[model samples]
Target: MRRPTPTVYVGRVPIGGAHPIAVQSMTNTPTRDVEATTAQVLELHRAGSEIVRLTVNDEEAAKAVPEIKRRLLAEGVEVPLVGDFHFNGHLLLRKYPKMAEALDKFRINPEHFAEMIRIAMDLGKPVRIGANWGSLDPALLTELMDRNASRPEPKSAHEVVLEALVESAVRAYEAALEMGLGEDKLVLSAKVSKARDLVWVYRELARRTQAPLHLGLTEAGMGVKGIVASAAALAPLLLEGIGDTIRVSLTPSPKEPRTKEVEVAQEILQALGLRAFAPEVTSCPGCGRTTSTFFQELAEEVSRRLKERLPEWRARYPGVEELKVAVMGCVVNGPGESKHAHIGISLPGAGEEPKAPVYADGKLLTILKGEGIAEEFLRLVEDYVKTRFAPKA
Candidate 1:
């Protein structure tokens, strides 16, 4: 089943209804520093983020909202912005109505959200009722803790967690209902730090409510572990029609590999046959019988250059979801397997043998020998993007 239709707007963007599940991320930059926060938000937009959020924990941080929006607009990045508020949210949001106005969305913790809902309603903007496991109201947590204290094995930690989360969400949902927010004006998230618990909590949420569920494995470390854990937990729910938007919350630092929440979302949806990534590269695993080195080198070149040239590429290629470019290790299954791709490449033999057969849009386009495969593949990708996405006036 799909989520409850969204009732509000995030800038010019709308959530719920037929809108695809959006990919989002949070900035680690200090919210008080417009430059740092702007830079991070821009980086996230470049990395395929659809919506970006930053913490507004203090007055100085709260004041940076408009400047950050201005900086992003100046750079020509137009993704929606969300103010992540906790503790004294009503106070800060009340203090800065225009700062709140400048944002595309407001994310409020349900614990303190009760106090801010009226302000949010008065602001005339949509809100994401983000219920995090780490920030549940203390009284609610205490009640849940007391309930679970008597279980034989604690009745599944996710169960206890979901109890609190659902209670928090129900309270929030009821308040919205009392104010007549209805489905369009409501969105919800049950986020947790643990992958398994995150999965179970959301699974319960899916069964219990129809509000758009935003999925996340909050603070899931970095690198392969974070990506894998997030994918493992989120992919299933999305395929089962459980999630509406998603976040892959990785710890950011001076050098932490930037989290690609959008890319991960793309990968998950593509793998489940629900969506596709920027480009599709089909390369055979090198076997003893075929020219594997050419395929490997060419594949890497195409991927590297794609990121390097995405702007020009995107402009040239409209509606070109997942540029399907394949470099196969052998001709055995090369052309036929990649018959539907926009571009295809196959090496004749493994290792030292350097013959590569490249195809385009199901036709035997050309055969290149030796080190020329990389150059040829690169040119082919560029040409394909230019021709397919080029505008016609």
Candidate 2:
């Protein structure tokens, strides 16, 4: 598999070039509301978003860009800010050149080449070919619809969708190059709403180009379904060396903004053995013998602990390298199958007091005793990270 070329500047932070896959998320906060937008940006920064993007949809929002940048700098939140402009990107960018300059990168449509190149040349930063099937130009969509309309045996809905996405993406790359942006100065994303198109379009784009590819299934529903479906679509492409950066967009709940996209991205990367952020969690499908509410609570508790302590945990254990910590529910074979794991737990059946067996590096630490088993188990894992293996931040 071909590795992606490195990147150095987007507004300010480097992406793609020897960098971990950068996590990004959009704000539901009104862009015109500088105070609110600034606060949300800081929150996302805390949540580990390497880059945050805001929609610059109107003159008021565009006018407030510098104020937002000022507030962000004052708070010491230096993560790169990206200006996301759709239809009238060129116009807004031209009017707000400093705001454009403040942005590390500008995500523009290929169809807006003239405006994109004009303003981008003035600023001399990167431009991402942010192609979306949902907002594709009439010309491209028509070509896609007509081309698919002629297949000998008729294209499957997925095939037709993938072709349109890939076509738009290829056109953008060609146009970007024609306009003279070097490979290092560009990134491409072909976002779709379905997993089939998500996987197929990215796979096809990888087959055709070497520019870094950002992967996501845009607006992938809400809650678990969104998370699972997005992961299913992205995991396969990632395994094939096809993604450079990733974003997992989820529908937000009313009480608060959902920035779990970063966590989801982290989990997917961890699952693939690419990077580790939090402890490994295990859950089993319920069967007759399992008496405790072990697996359900196990996931919730471990995830909660990881959430509260991640920043500190990430700082403490540079030894937790391939931290394959597990919380399996059965002892008979779970412990043996996961012997190589840095920490492993096998919950016992009814009346078994949930035998808290832990193995660190293939040797049993001890059978965790009674009520404090979960707490003790957590301490054991922390010790393993601190003593047995030093973690690298």
Candidate 3:
């Protein structure tokens, strides 16, 4: 039940039409610093980012792009680099063919909407027309506001903003088609700071057009607020099969790694059953039934182990990401919940039997006692994976 759209490739990665939704991220580097920017892009790529975007602000930044591409290629990382531009994009795209060719796609504010798409079509590259709330199209929005005011039943502020943003993107895409830019090479997005407006705007776009949509909750602020807002805005549209690619725009700080946003993006997609980048563990929070932190340790250990094995597991086993692991704290929900996963461990509570119950495929497999329970369970988890998910001869 995925949304229908033409495929647009950013190098080897395809954005829409029957492919898995891709996770994209942006770099904060100035782009002129080839070493720093290239290293960060490589960092993001290693953390599950399929597409990496960087600014192409001026001549120096523009000139540095091809070198960055070469550096990344030399390192064996082929993640597509998107030249993100707001102003002066027309001049940059036209002036520097080297930079233009190095970048996999041209993401413009649509400052030169027609000329932008045209320049891209010349290079045979794809275009991303990024529309934002901070810089909503004054030309088209004025028309919406003036037209709304003349009506007897005018729309609310929120109503005007939502429809206007969607209108801006839709109008822009239609205009590109009119200008002879093929729809297959075009992508559209309209981002807003407010999560509610973001969701409504994207929902409207899904209904109004077939262009591949790149999702983001712009300026999704710092800390947990940032993570929750992004998930809230994106999860809804994705649940309805409305997005082709996603970027969780977390506020980067000195303490936090930029690649953290890429991790968040993967979690959102995996949580929705759209894609699976790593294994998931279902563990209890440990109430009064658990007096000690032993169960919690077991849970964390199991999760870390699964994550560490994913790189090797994914290579050897194709469908291993579908693996589910449960580590429950106590007897309350332990046995039943453990039985639900592909492999799980259920430990006892205070004064109860010290033996830990392990389940595999809904069957009680064995009783594990003593402190070595975690070690045994993980081995069983790996053993189950090797036996069940391993390819047939």
In model 2, the runs with Cα more than 4 Å from the true position are 6-8, 134-154, 278-393
List runs of model 1 lying over 4 Å from the truth.
1-4, 134-158, 253-266, 279-313, 322-393
Question: Local distance difference test, per candidate?
Answer: 0.72, 0.74, 0.82
Model 1 misses residue 100 by how many Å? 1.3
Question: How many residue pairs in model 1 have overlapping backbones?
Answer: 11
Best by TM-score: 3
What value does the lDDT take at residue 257 in candidate 3?
52
Lowest lDDT block of 10, candidate 3: 108-117
Instruction: Quote model 2's TM-score.
Output: 0.69
Rank the models by lDDT, top first: 3, 2, 1
Return the clash pairs for model 3, or none. none
User: Using alpha carbons, what is the TM-score of model 1?
Assistant: 0.68
Worst 10 residues of 1 by lDDT: 349-358
TM-scores of the candidates are 0.68, 0.69, 0.72
